[model samples]
Target: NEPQLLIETWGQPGEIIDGVPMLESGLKPGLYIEGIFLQAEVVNRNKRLYPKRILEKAVKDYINEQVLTKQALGELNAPPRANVDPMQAAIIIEDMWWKGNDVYGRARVIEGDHGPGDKLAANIRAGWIPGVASRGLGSLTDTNEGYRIVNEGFKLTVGVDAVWGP
Candidate 1:
């Protein structure tokens, strides 16, 4: 229903919308959010080594609002890696998508070993996504990391008419 609405509102994927592609977030929304959170956790965790409080707050909020909903399967309680700082971990999770970075293509979560968009499952799973190694399913390596994660083959174009609602 949402996908159909999106298609109707934004037009089809690969089709330009105000000079940018409309269906580029892919036909899936779960993967979209997961990919974002994964990247945020990656860069922040690497630098701080402790979880960020902001991220904890965000996750807590998610649990209260989104997770508790019937559509969700409750919260995940993955303890931080041994000796790793929780604050840094939080930052890593929140910093997935930073300001100024353009997401022009699909966000991926890989499992086992395979090329992009190949072996990935279209469903969510439970388990610790290995840190940077299997973190968020697998590393968020862009072509620079031997595989491009964000900005693979597209460019985002925001229009002036875009608005946020309360």
Candidate 2:
């Protein structure tokens, strides 16, 4: 079977913005956006049901490599890839971990020089209503219940992306 494309856009900007614990901006010219990126063992807001261990394992594998290697780059929109495209990158995931079934993470805008980061930052300042969308490749098993469950072949290509976001 062809691999499924999972792009879950969770939470409206207002939904999550009010929930952000803290946002450090202009603090030494650096910015940090951190919070719950996604959740598992539960039906997603997008209606996908990911078993706790299914997602927990995916999260750990991603963190072990991408997050640790500092290559956990993500984009500004929904897209797919086992590895991210540098030109499309807008943010870098600094750290990611699982607390219960929730996926929590810390990130900063793209870079030192102005490229994707500058434009993305400008959009954020303009109140673009940042949102989180996960990009992954996998297949899903339909359930008798209300949601679709991702199969074992699933891979969370990128942890999170800032859209209009989480």
Candidate 3:
């Protein structure tokens, strides 16, 4: 069977800013604010099923089709907190990498008038914890309940605070 893919974020905690929760930290070094980075992994094997070069290329293609093209039309939905409406928020991926059996990444909030993206960014700058989320497609296996991700087709978005309480 195809492996079911899951994306998760782990980083600093969240902080409250003007009654809203936001991420407080920035992405790791070597990441560009204007572009996105992609990393792949094999959950069960703890290694890449394919070459790193191929994974990167695939990730770039996914971004161009899923992120860059749709963001402008307001098709991108990045929730600022858990249980919030995704379509109400806007986010941009900054960095991504693979660790152990999972893939982690970081994102920055898009600035705007009063949209979720704008509000999220404002909160982050205001000292809110910079929490991010991981979402993607994959498949699952039955033998030993193993799983493998389909390429590195993942999405990063602003997420709820992980440190500070709501």
Best by TM-score: 2
Give the candidate order by descending lDDT: 2, 3, 1
Candidate 2 clash pair list:
4-138, 130-165, 131-165, 131-166, 132-165, 132-166
lDDT for each residue of candidate 3 in 22-126, tens digit (9 for 90 to 100): 345732322112212223443322322333554555445545654455431111332233233445645544344445333344444455547766655555556
Q: Which candidate, 2 or 3, has the higher TM-score? A: 2
Worst 10 residues of 3 by lDDT: 29-38
Better of 1 and 3 by lDDT: 3
Which residue segments of model 2 deviate by more than 4 Å?
12-28, 80-82, 111-113
**Of the candidates shown, which would achieve the greatest lDDT relative to the real structure?**
2
lDDT of 1 at 97: 28
lDDT, candidate 2, 1-166, per-residue tens: 4686788876542222212344465223455567778778778777788788778878888888788988888887766555678888888888887778778887777655577777777776676657777777888887888778888857888887887643
lDDT of each: 0.22, 0.74, 0.38
Model 1 vs. true fold: TM: 0.20
Sequence-dependent TM-score of model 3: 0.43
Off by over 4 Å in 1: 1-51, 72-166
Question: Best to worst by TM-score, what's the order?
Answer: 2, 3, 1
Per-residue error (Å), model 3, residue 134: 2.4
